[PDB]
Structures are given as structure tokens and as C-alpha cells.
Amino acid sequence: GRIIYDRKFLMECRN
Amino acid sequence: EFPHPLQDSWSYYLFQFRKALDWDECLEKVATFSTIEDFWSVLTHTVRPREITYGKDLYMFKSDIMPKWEDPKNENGGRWLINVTARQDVDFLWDELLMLLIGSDWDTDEEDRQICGAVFQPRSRGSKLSVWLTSDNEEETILSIGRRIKERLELEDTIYFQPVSDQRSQTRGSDICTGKYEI
Ligand SMILES: C[n+]1cn([C@@H]2O[C@H](COP(=O)(O)OP(=O)(O)OP(=O)(O)OC[C@H]3O[C@@H](n4cnc5c(N)ncnc54)[C@H](O)[C@@H]3O)[C@@H](O)[C@H]2O)c2nc(N)[nH]c(=O)c21
């Protein structure tokens, strides 16, 4: 269920 | 390139005071996002915490929750309050905070269920970040959320958990800072 993203992944999506 | 869906849809509000508007009329919804890509787009297209003028605030809440105490999901709740220090970068604090929330990087589902939203309040007297939670009495869950926030934001100073009743009754200008819980 719960959709989880760590900061490493989130920041890779950003920059 | 297919967007990455988030656990929740979130809405982004700016609070801007103008005379002859009630508190709640000073809020305006500037975006609703539901993907990692649209989350970052919101932050790229809106004012950075380090650039914001004092007293103009940022509210990020799960979309079905209005950013006000009066919301059912908020009225029996409380906030973890973070008192920003001079050495701290507020862009870093805000970005780390919103990443934690939107990415739902809590250990357990129940912690995510508690989350209502986050608030950035730039103040000449000392700026504030808050996470609003749905209850004021789920001790164990509230405390693990507070611990995770401190970890992610690399916080040193004590953070304070304040039920909505205490926030409401709080007189503007008072220098007292206390919480039902502290860590
Ligand atoms: C989150 N919140 C805050 N307020 C009202 O806003 C006041 C200030 O809450 P704050 O969290 O901003 O506290 P702070 O001490 O940082 O306020 P400060 O005096 O520095 O003012 C910050 C900015 O808000 C404006 N402001 C302050 N009080 C009010 C008010 N009562 N109505 C409208 N604007 C206000 C100021 O002009 C300024 O732009 C609270 O004492 C409360 O009456 C709310 N009212 C309802 N009904 N529902 C809410 O959810 C709510």
C-alpha cells in the first residue's frame, strides 16, 4: 500500500 | 517520464495578510499536486523560504484537509513546533520537511495517517516550522513523528507539541514556549 520515497530518490528526481 | 504518483494529493497555500480580510480569507490555494514531478514544480514556481517577506506564510496540507484549526482533521489535533535559529537555512528545513511528508518517509502507516500538513512562518522575532497532526493524544505515534522530524531536519533545539486548544488560546506576542510533549 503505502507509497514511500526517500530523500535520495526525491532529490534525484529534482536535479 | 511517466509521473511518479505520491501516497497523497497535497495542496499548497500562501497566507498574506491584508487589512479588512479575516484570517481565513488571507489564505489562497496556489497549487494541488499528486506526483513527485508536480511537487518539485510547485517549489520551483513559488517563493523560496529564504526570499519570503515576514508574516507571509506557507501551508502544505493533504488536499481534503483545509489549512485551518476548524477542519475536522485538525480541530482535535496539534502541531510539532520548530523554532528556527539564526544559523539554520530555512530552504533546507522546508525542503527536507516537505520531502519527509510528501514521500511519506515514516516507518509505519499509522504515522502517515496522523499527518495533516506543514507550515512555514517567517518572523523577525524568530521563524517557525510546524507539522500539524490529526490527534493530540496518540502519544507513541506523535513522539515517533517528532523524532523522525528532528532526524530529517537535523534539529538540535527542543521541539514542542502543542494541541490546537493551546495554539488558539496563545496570545500573540507572548514569549512562553511549551508543549504537551517535548523532544
Ligand atoms: C493557524 N491560525 C492562526 N489564526 C489566527 O492568527 C493569529 C496569529 O497566528 P500565528 O500562528 O500567525 O501567530 P504569530 O504570533 O506568528 O502571529 P503574528 O502576530 O506574528 O502575525 C503573523 C501574520 O498574521 C497576521 N495576523 C495575526 N493575527 C491575525 C488575525 N487574528 N487575523 C488575521 N491575520 C492575523 C499578521 O498581520 C501577520 O501578517 C492567531 O492568534 C489566530 O488569531 C487562526 N485563526 C483561525 N480561525 N484558524 C486558524 O487555523 C488560525
B123 lines ligand 1 (CB under 6 A): yes
Q: Flag whether B56 is in a domain.
A: yes
- Domain assignment of residue B51, given as a range: 3-173
CB atoms within 10 A of CB B10: 23
Q: What is the resolution of this structure in A?
A: 2.1
Within a domain: residue B183? Answer: no
CA-CA distance, B113 to B65, in Å (whole number)? 12
Best of A7, A8, A15 to disrupt the B interface by mutation (most B CBs within 10 Å)?
A: A7
Whether B44 is covered by a domain: the verdict is yes
Experimental method of this PDB entry: X-ray
Of the residues B6, B44, B105, the best mutation for testing chain A's interface (the one with the most A CB atoms within 10 Å of its CB) is: B105
Please state the domain count of chain B: 1
Query: Looking at the domain assignment, is residue B182 inside a domain?
Result: no
Q: Is residue B132 included in any domain, yes or no?
A: yes
**Domain containing B63 — which CATH number?**
3.30.760.10
